[model samples]
Target: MEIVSKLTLKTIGAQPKPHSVKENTALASIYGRVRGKKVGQSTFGDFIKFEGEFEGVNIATGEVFRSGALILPKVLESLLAGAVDGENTVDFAVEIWAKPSEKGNTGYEYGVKPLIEPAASDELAALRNQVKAAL
Candidate 1:
């Protein structure tokens, strides 16, 4: 069976924390961010294999991913280039689906969809323009 986790995409840098924080303060910090911003809000059920922009720093969670470089899903990579400068806000969504393995793991394939197809976010539009230039 396959499962899905849909989350609003943010920055791309690191992976996740160990997923094994034993202290209450540690857990609280992971769960809370100041200025009322919500990071670390979503998660991939189990470690999965993906490339491109599929890997990123979870906004709600500040854990830097283990990947060598920042990567988004293939489909979303082209759309996210200009959105990563830390100023533009690109609200993209990634849907990951995976089958549960006997090892109690689910490795997923991912797809990216912008909340707005035409990309109302100017940041995303800038990304597309850059994408066109790069192509």
Candidate 2:
């Protein structure tokens, strides 16, 4: 499954501000609303618009992003879970692998798709569309 969903940023990426902490590391998270027009199957959930937070990390130089500090989908439930609170920001293309049936073909048993799109974009159209979608 190759699905595209929207992510509306609730807050900009900042330094760590986690509620808990270990030895020398600071903590923080990046969060927002998620939405998809056509996420397949009933297992995908009703009102699939969801809200979630990914852990924070410094990406390149001073630039920062939330999540992946402990590896991709450190919180796997968010990706596998439904979209409870929807907002339209940017599109993320996701890939899913499923279990094969008795006939030797995969099916949507759990209906989970891992996102495969790159986080950054250089496209002018997508940028403009986001502004329009917001307004």
Candidate with top lDDT is 2
User: For candidate 1, what is the TM-score?
Assistant: 0.23
lDDT of 2 by residue, 24-131 (tens): 321222233334323323553433333333333232233334431121222333543432334554323332222223432222122234345434566866897888
TM per candidate: 0.23, 0.21
Full-model lDDT, candidate 2: 0.32
Q: What is the lDDT of candidate 1?
A: 0.32
Whole-model Cα lDDT of every candidate shown, in order: 0.32, 0.32
- Where does candidate 1 have its weakest 10-residue lDDT segment? 27-36
**Residue 62 deviation, candidate 2, in Å?**
4.8
Relative to the unseen true structure, what is the C-alpha lDDT of residue 54 in candidate 2, on a scale of 0 to 100? 34
